[PDB]
Every structure is written in C-alpha cells, then in structure tokens.
C-alpha cells in the first residue's frame, strides 16, 4: 500500500539546522501533492509547507518563510525539509501527509511524525 | 487563513452515549470539511471527508452533516475506543487551517 514514513530530526540548539525526510511508496510519486504538519506540544495542528511535484510549485506559512525550504527527489519517491535558523518555537512533531485531489480536498494518508527539539 | 472553531473544546460522556461534535468556518468552506481522529502519541486518522462520506473501514457509528458556515460530526453510540482528540480542517482555500479540536472524555 501507500505509505510515508518520516526520519531525521533529534535536538538541537537555537540556531541550528535539521533535514526531515518522509519517503514515500505504494502510488505514482509526481500525482500528488505533499506537505508538512507541525503539531506543538499540547496544541493542535498547524500547516508548515506543501509542494506540487508535478510542477515544482511549493508555499510556505508565514512562521516559516525564508528559514524552511520544501523540495522532493522524485527518483528517490522522497520529499523533504530543511528547516535552518531553528528557534525554540519550533519544537513539534512534524508529520507529512499526501493530499488527494487537487469529494476530494483532503489528507489522505500521514507519516507517523518525528519529533523536533530546540533548546539550549 | 479562514478560521475554525470547534466545540465542544471537551466533553465528558460514558459508553453507548449519542454526541455530536461541532465546527464553524469563518465563512463558507462549500462542503470542503473534513474530519480527523488522533489518540495520544499517534498521527491523525480520517474518518470523514467532504461533509459526509466516510472513510473505508471506519465504523457506521459516525455520521456528518452541514453546510454554509456549520457541520457536524455524531457519534451514535460511543464505543471505548472511540473517547479520543477529534479534528475538522476546511479544504476549501488554501492553506489548509484545522479547528483546535474536541477531546472526548469519559464519564
């Protein structure tokens, strides 16, 4: 089946920099748009990025802009995030999910989510 | 951002209880709602999209409605596995922005 599954991620101080990965298997890789969640501890779900791989258009929450890059490596099935200047607010879990559809309009299928840290 | 507003934020409710779980858009979302269930240190599940359909294998149990401004999502009969964290998120303009979900406790 479709399955995404996320690694990277760990701790690290204020100002650092992390690549999360979620690879991707089970479907067509260039057919779906993909993005990231963040869920901060004891708040809810909070939209970071989405990437159209078919024609390479991403976006990005304002919080985000300019510190986060959203790219995929389409003959790995891979998309990934790299988050630099990391501040403390960006402690969550951040989950990748496949949208369907551009009765659609929605998450499909999530990643289990890794856990980022940071802190001093 | 169209905003979301979900309520009740918590309810306590025992075993084979009917409840029903709201959502308000700050306009209209156009049928575009969809609702997720998550349980502690796992990653959301949907059980409903688009207002009314549900997902493959999720239970008869819980139904949706709505329309304009407001949906709804009952639960028939609540089951032990079902006490739980519920979201709505609105597909209708993008970004995608989610309620501050509906924790469903027991009694």
């Known amino acids: 089946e479709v399955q995404l599954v996320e690694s990277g991620g760990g701790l690290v101080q204020p100002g650092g920099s992390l690549r999360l990965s979620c690879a991707t298997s089970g479907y067509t890789f260039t057919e779906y748009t993909m993005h990231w969640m963040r869920q901060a501890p004891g708040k809810g779900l909070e939209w970071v990025a989405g990437?159209?791989?078919?024609?390479?258009?991403?976006s990005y929450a304002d919080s985000v802009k300019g510190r986060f890059t959203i790219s995929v490596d389409k003959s790995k099935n891979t998309l990934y995030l790299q988050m630099n200047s990391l501040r403390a607010e960006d402690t969550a879990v951040y989950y990748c999910?496949?949208?369907?559809?551009?009765?659609?309009?929605?998450?499909?299928?999530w990643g289990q989510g890794t856990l980022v840290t940071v802190s001093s | 951002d169209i905003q979301m507003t979900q309520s009740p934020s918590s309810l306590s409710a025992s075993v084979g209880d009917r409840v029903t779980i709201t959502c308000r858009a700050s306009?209209?979302?156009?049928?575009?709602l969809n609702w997720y269930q998550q349980k502690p240190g796992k990653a959301p599940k949907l059980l409903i999209y688009?207002?009314?359909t549900l997902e493959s294998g999720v239970p008869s149990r819980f139904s949706g409605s709505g329309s304009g401004t407001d949906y709804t999502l009952t639960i028939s009969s609540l089951q032990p596995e079902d006490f739980a964290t519920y979201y709505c998120q609105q597909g209708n303009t993008l970004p995608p922005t989610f309620g501050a979900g509906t924790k469903v406790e027991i009694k």
């Open positions: 306009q209209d979302i156009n049928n575009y």
């Open positions: 990437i159209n791989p078919k024609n390479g258009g991403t």
């Open positions: 999910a496949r949208w369907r559809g551009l009765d659609v309009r929605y998450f499909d299928v």
């Open positions: 688009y207002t009314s």
